[PDB]
Scaffold this motif. Structure first.
Motif, PDB file in Angstrom:
ATOM      1  N   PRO A 213       0.780  -0.897   0.199  1.00 45.84           N
ATOM      2  CA  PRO A 213      -0.039   0.024  -0.486  1.00 45.84           C
ATOM      3  C   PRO A 213       1.005   1.464  -0.494  1.00 45.84           C
ATOM      4  N   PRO A 214       0.127   1.832  -0.457  1.00 46.41           N
ATOM      5  CA  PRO A 214       0.961   4.104  -0.005  1.00 46.41           C
ATOM      6  C   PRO A 214       1.884   4.145   1.016  1.00 46.41           C
ATOM      7  N   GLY A 215       2.208   4.525   0.792  1.00 43.40           N
ATOM      8  CA  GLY A 215       2.952   4.798   1.995  1.00 43.40           C
ATOM      9  C   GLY A 215       3.990   3.790   3.370  1.00 43.40           C
ATOM     10  N   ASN A 216       4.327   2.553   2.267  1.00 41.08           N
ATOM     11  CA  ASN A 216       4.976   1.884   2.735  1.00 41.08           C
ATOM     12  C   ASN A 216       5.814   1.130   1.894  1.00 41.08           C
ATOM     13  N   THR A 217       7.174   1.377   2.352  1.00 43.61           N
ATOM     14  CA  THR A 217       8.493   0.443   1.923  1.00 43.61           C
ATOM     15  C   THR A 217       7.817  -0.113   0.368  1.00 43.61           C
ATOM     16  N   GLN A 218       9.024   0.473  -0.538  1.00 46.90           N
ATOM     17  CA  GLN A 218       9.081  -0.412  -2.161  1.00 46.90           C
ATOM     18  C   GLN A 218       9.091  -2.024  -1.988  1.00 46.90           C
ATOM     19  N   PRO A 219       9.041  -2.161  -2.583  1.00 48.75           N
ATOM     20  CA  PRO A 219       9.102  -3.801  -2.506  1.00 48.75           C
ATOM     21  C   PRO A 219      10.262  -3.754  -3.535  1.00 48.75           C
ATOM     22  N   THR A 220      10.970  -4.980  -3.988  1.00 50.58           N
ATOM     23  CA  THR A 220      11.773  -4.957  -4.016  1.00 50.58           C
ATOM     24  C   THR A 220      11.737  -6.032  -5.847  1.00 50.58           C
ATOM     25  N   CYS A 221      11.889  -5.507  -6.348  1.00 52.26           N
ATOM     26  CA  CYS A 221      11.564  -6.481  -7.703  1.00 52.26           C
ATOM     27  C   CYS A 221      12.633  -6.995  -8.669  1.00 52.26           C
ATOM     28  N   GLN A 222      13.003  -8.587  -8.339  1.00 49.47           N
ATOM     29  CA  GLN A 222      13.585  -9.319  -9.271  1.00 49.47           C
ATOM     30  C   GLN A 222      13.378  -8.733 -11.045  1.00 49.47           C
ATOM     31  N   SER A 223      14.737  -8.292 -11.606  1.00 54.27           N
ATOM     32  CA  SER A 223      14.787  -8.111 -12.914  1.00 54.27           C
ATOM     33  C   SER A 223      14.534  -9.539 -13.760  1.00 54.27           C
ATOM     34  N   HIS A 224      14.224  -9.197 -15.536  1.00 51.65           N
ATOM     35  CA  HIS A 224      14.723 -10.351 -15.909  1.00 51.65           C
ATOM     36  C   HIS A 224      14.266 -11.848 -15.469  1.00 51.65           C
ATOM     37  N   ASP A 225      12.999 -11.954 -15.178  1.00 52.41           N
ATOM     38  CA  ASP A 225      12.218 -12.536 -14.018  1.00 52.41           C
ATOM     39  C   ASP A 225      11.933 -13.164 -15.300  1.00 52.41           C
ATOM     40  N   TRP A 226      12.086 -14.649 -15.997  1.00 52.84           N
ATOM     41  CA  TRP A 226      11.290 -15.667 -17.038  1.00 52.84           C
ATOM     42  C   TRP A 226      11.303 -16.976 -16.241  1.00 52.84           C
TER      43      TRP A 226
END
Length: 821
Positions: A213-226
């Motif tokens: 939700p807004p106001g919370n620490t942004q998620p850590t998103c893996q790139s090039h996830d196939w």
């Protein structure tokens, strides 16, 4: 036209009923047939009471057995890792072809690696349009005298396409996907109105446990996830403290007795870690062992009493493999943990909560706990895709596919419902595509998961590595193989099939171990992953490689396709054969037709070998074509012209030769036909001491050479026939065959007991009768296609491409799997 869908619950039937109303597919009407459980629906489909249902991979396997005889036909496409684009792959392959084959098409790729919609053939000046896969839109060929065609732009990426729908011509307050430069999804997606953010993989699938939700620490998103396989997981509440190895005696919630993620995956891990006293069917059933492991569980479809204790379906519905049981399925098992009837739930990542924050986490088999979004490193294995199934007969496959294709085009509410989760289909499903036409459960699930599931139902006796089960394709072969088995001392056994391709299937499925294949079947066998173990060496002149195994082979001795022309015809070179008059041994012959037809299409935009030549004789063509105008027929006129018998005077190796000397510019034949019919070696008049020095053979570089230099001036040499097996069995087969050959080969110590390379029961049984011996295949670090075929043949017949489909088995046996190591 009708499609009858089988539902397993009141909720599902209700949802399927809504679709009958809400989803209007012209030409096909849907109807809904209720049954009380997954198994009763399987039986309904077998009996024709219904046509289709969606099954967990575990039930896909159960359904494929003889009791039900169903097969997967439709499933959501998945991906294992990122791959080269098709155009760049195609470019690399064509550039690796035999450079002596000049003028081949090299695709043109764009800055993203896709095919330019306009494709052109440099050496011919022809252009045409292509689809995203680089396949010619037939009927768009434009010649060099015209300008290049105007071709529709390529289809958009999923992200840019989804971005186009969302906008819809003008958007506000709705999610609009954010795409990267290459047109794939950015790892982090945010909703432009609610302020929420989450991760997706490269094809836009949400990563569970990342919704923020807004106001919370942004998620850590893996790139090039196939990696889009689904993962079996054990989910627990953070308010408990046990680890995976301390599961004994806990309460558990499972998606269902027959589900891969709710049963096979955990039970597999329980057994490997020896948490479960149990190894073979001598310790009872696995269900009973699991019954002793947990105190109370909910495992829909179980019989053991404590394994239904935590379920909460009313009266006969309790513990049913059906949504009428509230704890059935992935979201039922999660609900069962949520409501605290269990301490752990076994389901898959697609059923995990979306939100990053909360009371749930994963129970890893290495005795640690990890957050929901770490399932890729905290799981009980990848599980197979799930699928729509129907009867093996496939009487309704088209209707089922057409209906679902059209329903998805029209965006019907297939994949959600107010009535509940995972009704009819998994709520996580986004698209359902047709599977390869020849797919079955074995090829859909893959050999690893298929065997893993079989292994829970029965003690699978693995056949001996000291015994080669030989696959035979007719009864005389089977009888010669039984003769071999009798003297072999158990080294040889026998199986029966009706054709070489069915032998390839038997070997893949572990029902046989070896078979000898004609060249025309090796592309399909190599694509499926089989390997040459030994090859038939046919060189009658040099027996050295046979006496001294491993020694160097001067000349393998296979035929060489050549272009035979007269010395007097000084104006004919390879490059100007167009229009001239040609002689082919017959349609379908490798040296006389397949090799010449392969080169002509490679260099002329797949223009018909019929239209390429002016007048030719090629027995097997249509009596009215230019490919039969030269064909005499029977000299005892009956009409037997252009026929595939000796009734045609221009048939076969000799027959193509006659055609040349009598009325033809070029004949396509093996290199031996000239020698065997000149120098007076044929007594018939037409070759009355015809001289071998009167003919030459065309080289691909426009030059020529005397018939004797066929080794350096040929269209292509054929590879030898090969004995193929599974990769892990190459060593065993080679060892057993070389031994058998020392006993029953041409110089075998016991050749009186049995001869491998002849029989009274018929000709060329098991092996070709002219085989000198079997030589071990020297596997080189290079493409098995190039290795087995040689670059010349690979290029001339297959464009040095791994994308030809000479058998519809190939798409099924190359189907990719979601397996573990």
């Amino acid at each position: 036209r009708h499609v009858q869908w089988c539902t397993i619950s009141h909720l599902e039937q209700k949802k399927c009923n809504d679709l009958v109303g809400s989803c209007n597919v012209p030409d096909i009407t849907l109807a809904c047939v209720y049954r009380s459980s997954t198994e009763n629906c399987m039986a309904a489909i077998k009996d024709g009471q219904a046509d289709a249902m969606f099954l967990d991979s575990g039930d896909v396997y159960k359904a494929s057995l003889d009791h039900y005889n169903l097969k997967p036909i439709i499933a959501e496409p998945y991906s294992l890792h990122r791959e080269l684009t098709k155009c760049l792959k195609h470019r690399q392959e064509s550039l690796g072809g035999d450079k002596m084959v000049k003028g081949r098409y090299i695709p043109q790729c764009d800055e993203k690696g896709n095919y330019h919609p306009v494709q052109c053939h440099a050496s011919t000046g022809y252009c045409w349009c292509v689809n995203a896969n680089g396949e010619k839109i037939e009927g768009t060929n434009t010649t060099p005298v015209q300008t290049p065609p105007t071709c529709p732009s390529q289809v958009l990426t999923k992200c840019l396409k989804e971005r186009q729908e969302a906008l819809g011509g003008k958007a506000i307050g709705r999610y609009i996907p954010q795409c990267d430069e290459q047109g794939n999804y950015r790892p982090m997606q945010c909703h432009g109105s609610t302020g929420y953010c989450w991760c997706v993989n490269a094809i836009g699938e949400k990563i569970e446990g990342t919704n923020t939700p807004p106001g919370n620490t942004q998620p850590t998103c893996q790139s090039h996830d196939w990696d889009t396989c689904h993962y079996a997981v054990a989910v627990v509440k953070n308010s408990s403290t046990f680890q995976f190895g301390q599961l004994k005696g806990k309460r558990s919630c499972h998606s269902g007795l027959s589900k891969t993620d709710g049963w096979n995956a955990p039970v597999n891990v329980f057994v490997e870690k020896k948490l479960l006293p149990w190894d073979g069917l001598a310790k009872g059933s696995i269900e009973r062992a699991v019954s002793k492991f947990f105190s109370a569980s909910c495992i829909p479809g179980a019989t053991e009493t404590n394994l239904c204790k935590q379920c909460i379906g009313e009266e006969e519905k309790k513990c049913k493999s059906s949504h009428d049981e509230p704890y059935y399925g992935d979201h039922g098992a999660f609900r069962c943990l949520q409501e605290d009837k269990g301490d752990v739930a076994f389901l898959k990542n697609t059923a995990l909560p979306d939100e990053h924050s909360g009371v749930y986490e994963l129970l890893c088999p290495d005795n640690t706990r990890k957050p929901l979004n770490k399932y890729k490193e905290c799981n009980l294995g990848k599980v197979p895709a799930d699928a729509v199934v129907t009867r093996k007969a496939g009487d309704k496959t088209k209707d089922i596919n057409d209906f679902l294709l059209e329903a998805q085009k029209k965006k019907c509410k297939l994949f959600g419902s107010p009535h509940g989760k995972d009704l009819m289909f998994d709520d996580s499903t986004t698209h359902l595509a047709p599977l390869p036409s020849e797919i079955d459960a074995f090829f859909f699930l893959g050999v690893k998961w298929y065997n893993a599931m079989k292994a829970l139902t029965e003690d699978v006796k693995l056949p001996s590595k000291n015994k080669v089960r030989w696959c035979t394709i007719n009864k005389p072969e089977m009888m010669k193989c039984k003769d071999w088995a009798a003297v072999s001392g158990g080294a040889i056994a026998c199986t029966e099939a009706s054709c070489p391709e069915h032998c390839v299937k038997q070997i893949l499925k572990g029902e046989a171990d070896a078979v000898t294949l004609d060249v025309q079947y090796m592309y399909m066998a190599l694509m499926c992953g089989l390997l040459p173990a030994v090859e038939e060496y046919p060189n009658k002149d040099d027996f050295h490689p046979c006496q001294i195994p491993g020694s160097t082979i001067k000349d393998f001795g296979t035929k060489r396709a050549v272009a035979l022309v007269k010395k007097s015809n000084k104006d004919i070179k390879w490059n100007n054969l167009k229009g001239k008059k040609s002689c082919h041994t017959h349609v379908g012959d490798i040296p006389g037709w397949v090799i010449p037809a392969g080169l002509i299409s490679n260099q002329n935009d797949n223009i018909d070998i019929e239209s390429f030549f002016g007048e030719s004789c090629a027995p097997g063509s249509d009596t009215n074509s230019k490919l039969c105008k030269l064909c005499i027929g029977d000299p005892e006129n009956p009409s037997t012209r252009c026929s595939l018998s000796d009734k045609e005077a221009y048939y076969g190796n000799e027959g193509a030769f006659r055609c040349l000397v009598e009325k033809g510019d070029v004949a396509f034949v093996p290199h031996t036909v000239v020698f065997a019919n000149t120098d007076g070696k044929n007594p018939a008049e037409w070759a009355k001491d015809l001289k071998s020095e009167d003919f030459e053979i065309l080289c691909l570089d426009g030059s020529r050479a005397p018939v004797t230099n066929y080794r350096g001036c040929n269209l292509s040499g054929l590879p030898p026939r090969a004995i193929v097996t599974r990769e892990e069995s190459v060593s065993d087969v080679v060892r057993i065959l070389i031994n058998q050959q020392s006993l029953y080969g041409r110089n075998g110590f016991e050749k009186d007991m049995f001869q491998m390379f002849s029989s009274a029961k018929g000709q060329n049984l098991l092996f070709n009768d002219e085989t000198q011996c079997l030589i071990e295949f020297d596997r080189q670090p290079k493409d098995i296609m190039e290795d087995y075929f040689g670059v010349r043949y690979y290029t001339a017949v297959y464009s040095a491409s791994r994308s030809a489909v000479p058998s519809e088995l190939i798409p099924a046996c190359t189907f990719k799997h979601c397996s573990n190591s």
